Curated annotation (Swiss-Prot), chain B:
Pfam families assigned to the protein according to its UniProt record, in alphabetical order: Iso_dh
Cofactor requirement: Mg(2+); Mn(2+)
Protein name: Isocitrate dehydrogenase [NADP], mitochondrial
Induction comment from the UniProt entry of this chain: By growth with glucose as a carbon source.
Chief location: mitochondrion
Organismal lineage: Eukaryota, Fungi, Dikarya, Ascomycota, Saccharomycotina
Binding annotation for NADP(+): T73, I74, T75, R80, K259, G309, T310, V311, T312, R313, H314, N327
Gene symbol of the encoding locus: IDP1
Length: 410, 408
């Protein structure tokens, strides 16, 4: 059929295991037949990474920065058993972290809602998006064991004693053995977090809430609150008002409670640790990870990386490897493509592309909603594990493919 | 009447909960028990009138006789200081009591089958234990104006038995923020003992959650101490009861928690305990069915109270002569749970029986008689005025049912 010309190159990052499998199928059956796009391919499989000494990972990030918009497949984050499983030169760092830090920007997780599929928190009918500040609180902290009595201090010595002054803060006086830890964060990173959060809220046309425990951590957390407020008043307030959306700081205690009581439909910006823990809570609350997507947004709002929020689905890959039946959800991976192409269409002002992206999504979701064709993970939420309620990994892709063709005739 | 061997320490509170507290004592307690109630008025006024001294006297008394029954109290803050013209912004009475008694607070929701929960699958209590000693809650934080180094420095009292430590935390290339916190093996060990005794008492599985994958030393310490404490005194008891202890990464626990049907205990570090307690409570429904107990390491001192506040919004209406529908179930349980502990300690099976009948009468007023306050009716999808009853009407109903229940 007629192909849509994609003006700017799209960066594609291949992953491994199960997702690598459905990725190739999604491409040939759902993308390549309708678009004339130039894909800058970067293989991020563990095998490819271990070979290039993890260089392709960096090269891929650079590519995304250069062209704007990357579309990524889940990848394996090597650990102990992984190093032996593939005979790696060493436990490489998670490609997700390496790319995220190279591009700057923040990651926002968004669940896809399908009416027909109940949520564990049934009241949730609209997505609750979680943005996580992944810079350096507890994830870059220094912790140790205090052996016995003594004093603990936080000491800061400025590189320039003329403008700033030294700090020597008393933390605690141990009367026995125990534990200690110190962490940091910077104005620069927090500022990017704010910018990335406001731009996504504008794009999504959703209310934005920042959560901290500023009542306790008066300075530390207070810092996040002040920078968001400052960045807001100066560059986004007027834009939030035109759309009818609002920004607001809320105590993590209140936000968290108001969150599970709501019906959803808004964005929560959170600090490293809260974002980590709350993302797992929200995802599970909506249901299957097969419906959790994610988008990386930079402060300048010119660079994006699109990828499913779940992993390589290793357990399903073990079955696949033996020829055993699998029911893996391809929905999130498909949306990695549609959301990435959508951004591609927006930056190049190519409505044609944007239109196709919304059609791919519609075809995908109506397959479940209207036709009732779905994978096991989805059927489980309905209370139907009978091998007649769900369909196989490939059967689902076949269904959406057929549906796309139909909905594409206009 | 039923004779309560040891004295029960009673702390009175403020606003709406103070109102229901007096009606409860007089209608559901005093008529059936011959108990010596050591009374302590912990209202905002009483506290500000004694420079917060009754608070301490109260805790000391709980420490003396064992169990305490407390009414929700007002925690001073900028706003409250102007409202009552408080001399000083007195700190949380719960905190002060917690410090004197040591011990850990466990939040347990009351599940009434007829009343739906927001997380529909939760049909069994999910109890959260909070280590409220001090991580972020006793940390020192500061702003960092610009480029410079940041270090953690430890100097031992006896540089003969311990080595000093000077760890590079970070080199700022720009302005930012810094923070440091601590915890002690002592409190962690206390936190462990209380958790285990509560699991044994409730006969439920116990789970400890941390981020020991990132905070290898700090959180690995909680893990190791709990394990040590577990094997040192509770493993066999757990084995006899058929319950299990386990450490879980917070990421896994929380995901598992929301996917479960409830029925277990989660011991959490200070911060997670705080945030997760609010999630769990809201998942079950009204804060009106939320209870809590303070449990000391030795397992001989308890403080029972509603897990909710003074219900200020409802108090104003009460002030304007307007009708109210405040759920008193949680307050009544504060009495029942406390009295149950009193009996367990005094080996007074009679007191324990009363306690269980008071809880049966209360809950059945809702489950069978269909008499409930507004919060519960709303949870049932009933938004009609005729669907619920007033604060006093509900108490009147429990009172009547209690009399019938006691008959046999
Ligand atoms: N690159 C990334 O973005 C990323 C993110 C996270 C993890 N990972 C990596 O992925 C590998 C495996 O991680 P993991 O053990 O957490 O597996 P996972 O891919 O995170 O999935 C865990 C489980 O969730 C369910 N699930 C996830 N996606 C599904 C889908 N699309 N359809 C149906 N069910 C789905 C399955 O449960 P059932 O087995 O019960 O069906 C699956 O076993 C590891 O190397 C990990 O580091 C990569
Ligand atoms: N002593 C304690 O353990 C304790 C604990 C928490 C707070 N406090 C104190 O309480 C004051 C702040 O209160 P707050 O703003 O947190 O309000 P709250 O007393 O915590 O209750 C907030 C809302 O939850 C619902 N609710 C709570 N208890 C209920 C009940 N028994 N029956 C029916 N509905 C109930 C009501 O919502 P609707 O308005 O929708 O009816 C109520 O307005 C401060 O003095 C604070 O220090 C004390």
């Amino acid at each position: 059929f007629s192909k849509i010309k994609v003006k700017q190159p799209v960066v594609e990052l291949d992953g491994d295991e199960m997702t690598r499998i459905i990725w190739d199928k999604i491409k040939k059956k759902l993308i390549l037949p309708y678009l004339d796009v130039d894909l800058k391919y970067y293989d991020l499989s563990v095998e490819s990474r271990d070979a290039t000494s993890d260089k392709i990972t960096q090269d891929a990030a650079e590519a995304i920065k250069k062209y704007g918009v990357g579309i990524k497949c889940a990848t394996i984050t090597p650990d102990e058993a992984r190093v032996k499983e593939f005979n790696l030169h060493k436990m490489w760092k998670s490609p997700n972290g390496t790319i995220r830090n190279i591009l700057g920007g923040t990651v926002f997780r968004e669940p896809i809602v399908i009416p027909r599929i109940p949520r564990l928190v049934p009241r949730w009918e609209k997505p609750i998006i979680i943005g996580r500040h992944a810079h350096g609180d507890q994830y870059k902290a220094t912790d140790t064991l205090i052996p016995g009595p003594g004093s603990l201090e936080l000491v800061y010595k400025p590189s320039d004693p003329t403008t700033a002054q030294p700090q020597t803060l008393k933390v605690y006086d141990y009367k026995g053995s125990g534990v200690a830890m110190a962490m940091y964060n910077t104005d620069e990173s927090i500022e990017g977090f704010a910018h990335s959060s406001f731009k996504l809220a504008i794009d999504k046309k959703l209310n934005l809430f920042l959560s901290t425990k500023n009542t306790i951590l008066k300075k530390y957390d207070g810092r996040f609150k002040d920078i968001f407020q400052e960045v807001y008043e100066a560059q986004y307030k007027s834009k939030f008002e035109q759309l009818g959306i609002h920004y607001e700081h809320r105590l993590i205690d209140d936000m968290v409670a108001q969150m599970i009581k709501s019906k959803g439909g808004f964005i929560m910006a959170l600090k490293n640790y809260d974002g980590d823990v709350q993302s797992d809570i929200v995802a599970q609350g909506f249901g299957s990870l097969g419906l959790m997507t994610s988008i990386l947004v930079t402060p300048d709002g010119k660079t994006f990386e699109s990828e499913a929020a779940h992993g390589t689905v290793t357990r399903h890959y073990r079955k696949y490897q033996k020829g055993e039946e699998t029911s893996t959800n391809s929905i999130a991976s498909i949306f990695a493509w549609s959301r990435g192409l959508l951004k591609r269409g927006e930056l190049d002002n190519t409505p044609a592309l944007c239109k196709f992206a919304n059609i791919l999504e519609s075809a995908t979701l109506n397959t479940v909603q209207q036709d009732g064709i779905m994978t096991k993970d989805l059927a489980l939420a309905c209370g139907n594990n009978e091998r007649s309620a769900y369909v196989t990994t490939e059967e689902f892709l076949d269904a959406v493919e057929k549906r796309l063709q139909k909905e594409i005739k206009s």
